Design a binder for this molecule. Structure first.
Ligand code: HEM
Ligand code: HEM
Ligand SMILES: CN(C)Cc1cccc(OCc2ccc3ccc(N)nc3c2)c1
Ligand SMILES: CN(C)Cc1cccc(OCc2ccc3ccc(N)nc3c2)c1
Ligand SMILES: C[C@H](O)[C@H](O)[C@H]1CNc2nc(N)[nH]c(=O)c2N1
Ligand SMILES: C[C@H](O)[C@H](O)[C@H]1CNc2nc(N)[nH]c(=O)c2N1
Ligand SMILES: [Zn+2]
Lengths: 411, 407
């Protein structure tokens, strides 16, 4: 069965066969679409088919399908599962899996860069302190003095689900949020709950508006431990506007390395519950979501006041106006400091090319339109008018419950 | 089976049951989501009629009454006899209001119960259709104080006697492919501005030329009619800041009147059913003015603003796009022509959404279409999970007549 998507701006039609190789479920049925829902201990019984499916893909990509190396590997993995109820990936397999998980991320606009992922293998790690050391080396390598490089560090896989490695932070670098007695929040509102835990775990909070959160790391199912990232390793960027001089006086800065640390890497049925990865920012991630979301720093108001906007009627589009200037500042500041960043026009443009190429060479590209389209200026980027098919391929990145909800405290 | 949706900006959770009454299909499967795709007999007819009549009579607190059971019987007979059937006026009004209420892609549904329905089922000719359409346009416009309306022409019979309005909206601007190879006027309507000539329109080959109506009645060849200009209310577009804005020579019409959809009620098919409301500002300013495949005036507007159009990262398209939209809203409001901004509309939609969850058990909604084409995440709908499903009565797409019409 074939499927076609159409770009309504350019009339380009593409044909999808890759969706046939789709395993997981979307959430949708013939009767209902869950396309806008944010979120839609494994037995040997169900592990070997997963392992085979992965190994077959892998040996196909290297053009050794049905070879002796391929067959011997199947058998080696077979014997290891029935003997140990799990298996270990070669370095070759691990790198491949990590890159492909990224490649299969239907919600990712940055996938053009997927082949260039730096993979650090942290599967020999046994402690939190070890975890800290690995993460530090990730942060330094990825940051590269502002010249950002995509990387992922991969800690040991889940075994019986009772010995999990987890990074408790949602991103390796993020600012504290503190709820005040009056109800106002100091810092980043998204991180209030997490900041509380850290403080309770013994963090001494500087209690400013831009405090870098400490790392909270869990090894082999043990209680998590606090570590402070060396500040010389945390690249931060002061935010100024190229025309508005009072902008600097807003006192804003952001960090340069976006590094998501709370997802789950599934490769060949194996589960990697700590797999922090990093790229670089699309400007609107900071400029629209981080600053101007109502449930974040929410500086639309103050930026608007200082612009002397008519904030009386909403039909004056004072929010829209201010939002654009803030995004202008973000790109400006980052580029001035020679810290890698991409604008949403450039990023979405690059994605359409990636997507077309993926259709030609791979037979499809799963994409989630709800997430690919940027959170401002939607229709003036080319992804808006691009039809997309969504489906799930493995290897993949998955969500997981927050660790403070599932963890069994030792003491 | 009892689904929940969360708003991630407000933590509010609504539960959906209404989806369980869904009849049609989505395009999607358990293996693949098509959410972003634009377009996904006697024994057929009675169950359809019954389903409608059941929900109709339930809505007036007379489910299983004499009237209800009598009516089911009555319609059963007419179907068995005539192979089709006719709606009572009450049912027709209820059906139209509900086709709108069920339009999952429509952000403006808070107004759904206040629809004026004009029954034009007694119409026989293109000249007839023209008269009814002029009356619709005058009523709806209401000297700028816009009122929602729909005009309903006779239902399909055997697909050979179809009434169709060939225009995609009752009011739209002409577009002509030039020897220069570019495009004057509105590029969306180049093919249609052509067909108007193939049937003999005398195009004043200009820019904002109001297209003539091309009406087909009872399956006959369509005929051209020119809407009286005094019935077409227009708004000159000026910026409340940039005096040079007026120089761009821009205007738009106030009445958005969609005329190419198919209204389905209780199994019956109304292929000519032009309906109208009022614009959300971004429909004109973001899409009509700035789409690459439309008036595409971004380049020009940014130039008069003297923005650095050298690098995409200056966000000059963004800055200009906003100004353009400010003007549109400003012009309409200053001319006392009804319009709504995307902030207000989306806010009203969350309210409507909450009402529908409360008094109906839900609200089918297509996020890809509800979220405005600019400033997405600064409107409340961006953070609103929605469920999409197909309820009936409904408005459906239908092929362009020229691709179909037996000539
Ligand atoms: C290198 C530059 C990159 C850019 C510019 C980029 C951009 C983005 C953006 C804007 C989103 C949407 C996030 C949101 O608004 O919530 C996203 C999502 C995502 N990215 Fe990329 N990304 C990059 C690299 C990466 C890398 C290196 C990986 C994995 C190794 C990755 C995996 C993902 C995944 C799995 C999601 C979806 C998150 C979710 O499902 O909640 N991205 N990306
Ligand atoms: C009165 C104020 C109204 C507002 C503000 C409004 C707004 C909108 C908007 C913004 C869209 C998105 C379409 C696009 O961007 O191209 C839309 C679609 C739609 N509207 Fe409403 N509308 C209104 C009245 C009506 C009425 C009176 C009807 C029918 C009786 C209606 C039926 C529909 C339908 C069926 C769609 C989706 C059509 C499609 O699938 O393309 N709307 N509306
Ligand atoms: C706190 N979590 C539950 C929410 C969450 C967890 C993980 C990922 C996520 O999506 C945002 C995201 C993920 C990966 C990215 C990679 C590069 C980049 N520039 N931005 C990203 C942005 C959102
Ligand atoms: C040529 N066709 C693709 C145009 C077309 C056909 C069918 C539906 C359609 O949807 C746009 C639409 C529909 C109804 C509306 C009602 C009020 C309003 N302000 N805008 C609307 C906008 C647009
Ligand atoms: C490809 C995609 O389905 C298409 O561009 C859709 C996206 N969302 C839209 N949303 C609205 N309101 N109107 C549209 O025409 C579209 N077009
Ligand atoms: C309700 C919806 O699922 C949710 O708000 C989504 C919408 N689209 C998004 N798109 C991106 N890139 N990031 C997001 O967090 C979201 N949030
Ligand atoms: Zn779907």
């Amino acid at each position: 069965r074939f499927l076609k998507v159409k770009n309504w701006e350019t009339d380009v039609v593409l044909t999808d066969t890759l969706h046939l190789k789709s395993t997981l479920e979307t959430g949708c049925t013939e009767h209902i679409c869950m396309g806008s829902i944010m979120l839609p201990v494994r037995t040997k019984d169900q592990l070997f088919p997963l392992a085979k499916e992965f190994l077959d893909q892998y040996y196909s990509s290297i053009k050794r399908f049905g070879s002796k190396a391929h067959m011997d590997r199947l058998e080696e993995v077979n014997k290891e599962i029935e003997s140990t109820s799990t298996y270990q990936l070669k370095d070759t397999e691990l790198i491949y899996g990590a890159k492909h998980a990224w490649r299969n991320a239907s919600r990712c606009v940055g996938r053009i860069q997927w082949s260039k992922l730096q993979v650090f293998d942290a599967r020999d790690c046994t402690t939190a302190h070890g975890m800290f050391n690995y993460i530090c080396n990730h942060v330094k390598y990825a940051t590269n003095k502002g010249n950002l490089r995509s990387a992922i560090t991969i800690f040991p896989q889940r075994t019986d689900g009772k010995h999990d490695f987890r990074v408790w932070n949602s991103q390796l670098i993020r600012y504290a949020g503190y709820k005040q007695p009056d109800g106002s929040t100091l810092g980043d509102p998204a991180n209030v709950q997490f900041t509380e835990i850290c403080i309770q775990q013994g963090w001494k909070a500087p209690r400013g508006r831009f405090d870098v959160l400490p790392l909270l790391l869990q090894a082999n199912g043990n209680d998590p431990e606090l570590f402070q990232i060396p500040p010389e390793l945390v690249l931060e960027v002061p935010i100024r506007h190229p025309k508005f001089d009072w902008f600097k006086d807003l006192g804003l800065k952001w960090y340069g390395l976006p590094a998501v640390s709370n997802m789950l890497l599934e490769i060949g049925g194996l589960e990697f519950s700590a797999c922090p990865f990093s790229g670089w920012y699309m400007g609107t991630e900071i400029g629209v979501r981080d600053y101007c979301d109502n449930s974040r720093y929410n500086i639309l108001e103050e930026v608007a006041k200082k612009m002397d906007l008519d904030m009386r009627k909403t039909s004056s589009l004072w929010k829209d106006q201010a939002l654009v200037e803030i995004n202008i500042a973000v790109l400006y500041s980052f580029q001035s400091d020679k810290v890698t960043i991409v604008d949403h026009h450039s990023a979405t443009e690059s994605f359409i090319k990636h997507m077309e190429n993926e259709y030609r060479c791979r037979g499809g590209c799963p994409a989630d339109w709800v997430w690919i389209v940027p959170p401002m200026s939607g229709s003036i980027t080319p992804v808006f008018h691009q039809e997309m098919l969504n489906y799930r391929l493995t290897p993949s990145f998955e969500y997981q419950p927050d660790p403070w909800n599932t963890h069994v405290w030792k003491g």
